[PDB]
Symmetry: D3
Subunit: 141 residues, 6 copies
C-alpha cells in the first residue's frame, strides 16, 4: 500500500467559530491537508510549488464543522498533485461541497531544489483516470 | 434516530504544530468536540458542568494528526455524559490512543439554571453497557 | 479617478515570524490584500469567488518582510480579477519575487447572489495589456 | 523551603476579553499553572499524567480577571498532585470560585517514562491533611 | 475607599511561552494592566492617551512568569497617570525587575472627547510623594 | 548607503480587523518596525532598551489599514534611536497620523551587554537636525 492513493489520503476537520469564513482561512487549511498527504507520501521536507483552480462553490458560516480531505492524484518525477475538497456541515441539521483545489507539492534537496519523488501508482479505474487528468494539468505547467 | 449515540457522534482532526503537546492544548480540543456532540443532542446553548478522569495514556508529539472523537454515553435528567477519545497518528513513520475523558455537559435556559435534557436511547449491546457505567458514575456525583 | 487601477491599488507588509513559511500562510495574506482592493473598488461587502495560478516562485524564509501588492486587472459584469504579487526582503543580508496569483472576487447584495460590478477603465498601455489577458482568462471560465 | 508547598505555589492571572468563557480555555490555563508548580518543584521536564474532578462551579464572563492558583498536595515516588483553583473577579465591583481540579504531573526520563520525583514534605496540619487526601486519591489511581 | 490607590491597584501574571521576549509583547501586556486600573478607577469606557519612559531594565527570557503590576499615581482633571511595574520570575533556578512605565489614560464620553476624571486621594507618605512627581510630569506635558 | 537613514528605513502595513484598536496592539507593532530598522542597521541581535513619548494622537478603528514607518534618527556608541510613525487609512475614502514614538535599541554581546554599534551618518539637513535632536534626548537618558 505504500505510494498508493489510500496510503496518504488525509483529512482535517475544524469547528469554525460579517459572519462567513474568509477564503484565506479556507485556503490555508487546504494547504495543510495537502501538506499532510504530500508528507505521508514522501517522508521528506515538503513545500507548495503551486495551486490551481481554487474554486469557492459557496459560503461557510460560523458554527459549521468543515471536513478538508486530500488525495494524491498524480506524480511527475519531481512533483506531487493533490486534490483537496472542503465540505461544510451545520451543527444542527445537510452536508455541502464548499471548496476544491489542486495543489502541486515538491520535495527539496539541501540546495533548495526539487528532488526525485516516490511515484504514485493508481490501482483502480478512478485513480488511473485522475492520474491521466493530473498528467494533463501538469504538462500545462 | 435523533437522541441516539450515532445521531450526535462527533469528531475533529487537528494537525499538531509547534516535541510534546502540553495537556492543556489537548484538553481544550476535547472540550470542543464534547461541546459539539452536546449541541447536536439537545439543540440548546451549551456549557460544560464537569470533566472526569482525563487520562493521558501517553505523550502527543509534534507532527501528529489527532482524531478527537466524542460520543454520548448517558443522560441524566438535567445532564449528559460524553466520552471523548484522542487518537494520535504520526505522519512520518504507529497510530495510538493518546488521551480519554468523560465530560458531563448541561443544557441551559435563556437565563441561568440548566433546563431538562432529551433522553438518550442505547440500541447496541455496547451502548447498553456504556450507559450503565455512565449511570454508575453519575450516581457517585 | 474612481474605478481605475490606481484608485484601489493596495498592499500589506508583514514581518515573517516563526525556516520556510508554508504556502498556506502566504495564500491567506494574498487573499487579505485581494479583499482590500475589491472593497475599495466596489464599496459593497465582499467575497472571493475563485483563485487561479497561485505560483510559489520560491521559498519565503523567516526574517523576511513581505510586500503583498494587489491591483485590479479586469472586471466582468459581476466579477473582478485582481493580481496579487508577493515580494520578499531579507532584513539581514537580495530582494525577490516570492509568489503571484490571480484572484477573482464577487460583489454581493444584502442577501446571497452577487450584484453587478462597477466597470474598470485602463489608462496606460500596460493596463490595456493586462485587461485583455484578464478578459482572456475569464472567457475560459 | 525546597520541596515544601509554599516553595512551588504559583498562580497566573488573566484578563479574559455567547458571552461566557469555554471550559477548554479554563482547563488549558489550569494545566499551565499546574505545570508551573510541577516545574518549580522538580526542575526537570514535566508532563500531565491525568486530571480529575474538573468541576465548573459557575460561569465566567468577558471582562473578568481570573486568578488561577496552584499548590502541590501530594507526591508518590514518581508523581505529583497539584490542586488548582480558579477565581473570577469583575472589573467593576465580588470575588467568586469558578473552577477547581486535581492535576497529577509526571517527570520523564530520556526513554519517556516517569522518574523518581522530589518528595513533597507537608509542614502544617492543613498540608498534612491534603497530603493524606492526595495519597487516597492516588491509590484509586 | 473608592478613588484611592489601593482601590484600583491591579496586576496580571503571565507565563512567557516561545530566548528573549521582544519589547513589543511586554508593552502590550503593560497596557492591559494599565487599562484595568483605569477602568476600575473611573468606571467609563477607557483609552490610552500616551505612555512615557518605558524602561527595559533587562531582558525577559522564556520560562519566566511575569507579574505586571499597576497602580494609579496621579490624576489631572481629564487624565490619569498609572505606573506599571514588570517583575520576572524564572521557574527553574533570582527574581528581578524587568520593565517599568508611566501610562497616561483618558476617560471618554459616549462620543469622542474625554470627560472629566474622578480625583485620586493619596493617604500614605509614599503615595503623597508619587503624586507630586506625577503632578510634575504632567506639567511638562 | 550603508549606515544612512534611507538604508534601514522600514515600514509594515496591517489590516486591523468596543470598536477601536488597543494602544498595546499599536505599541507592539511599532516595536516590530523599530526592531526591523535596528536589524537592517546592525545585522546583529537587537533588543529594546527604552521607549519614549508614545503619543496616541487619535483612535484607530476596525477596518483601517495602518502604515507603521520607522527611520533611525540618532546613534550613540552603543545605542540606536528610531522614530516610529503610525498612519491610519479607512478602506473607503483620508490618511491621518494616529501615533508616534522614539525607540532606543541596543545590540547585545554574548554576556548580554550593549556592544559598539555601527554609526548612523546623517546626509541631509533634515537628518542632521534629527541626529542633533536625538543626541539631546539621549543625554537626558
Amino acid at each position: 500500500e505504500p505510494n498508493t492513493v489510500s496510503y496518504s489520503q488525509s483529512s482535517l476537520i475544524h469547528l469554525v467559530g460579517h459572519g462567513f469564513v474568509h477564503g484565506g482561512v479556507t485556503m490555508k487549511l487546504m494547504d495543510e491537508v495537502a501538506g499532510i498527504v504530500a508528507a505521508r507520501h514522501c517522508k521528506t521536507n515538503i513545500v507548495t510549488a503551486s495551486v490551481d483552480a481554487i474554486n469557492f462553490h459557496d459560503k461557510i458560516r460560523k458554527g459549521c464543522v468543515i471536513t478538508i480531505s486530500g488525495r494524491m492524484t498524480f506524480t511527475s518525477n519531481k512533483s506531487m498533485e493533490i486534490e483537496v475538497l472542503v465540505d461544510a456541515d451545520p451543527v444542527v441539521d445537510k452536508r455541502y461541497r464548499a471548496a476544491s483545489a489542486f495543489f502541486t507539492y515538491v520535495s527539496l534537496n539541501q540546495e533548495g531544489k526539487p528532488m526525485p519523488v516516490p511515484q504514485l501508482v493508481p490501482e483502480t479505474e478512478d485513480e488511473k483516470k485522475r492520474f491521466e487528468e493530473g498528467k494533463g494539468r501538469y504538462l500545462q505547467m
